[PDB]
């Protein structure tokens, strides 16, 4: 279906299955956001830090790691 990976499907099945909880330091950032991932927090590994994203329902065409990128400009 939509682009999910077992590197976070062994994380999002430990996140969504038991409600809303402490986050997962998610190594696999490149995924596509399910509609039951709203409110949930799934982080983005930028190279050092699994920096998280505030998940919004506008992330259909939009994707996860935009709000948590690697690089900073000013």
């Amino acid at each position: 279906g939509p682009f999910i990976d077992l590197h976070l499907l062994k994380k999002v099945e430990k996140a969504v299955e038991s409600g809303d909880k402490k986050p997962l330091r998610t190594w696999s950032r490149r995924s596509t956001i399910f509609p039951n991932m709203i409110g949930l927090t799934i982080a983005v590994h930028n190279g050092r830090q699994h920096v998280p994203v505030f998940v919004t329902d506008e992330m259909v065409g939009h994707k996860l790691g935009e709000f948590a990128p690697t690089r900073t400009y000013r």
């Binding site: 279906g1 077992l6 499907l9």
Partner: peptide
């Protein structure tokens, strides 16, 4: 199109 083959796809990575 199913996710069990997608679970078969990358349950290892190396």
């Amino acid at each position: 199109r199913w996710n069990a083959v997608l679970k078969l796809q990358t349950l290892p990575r190396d």
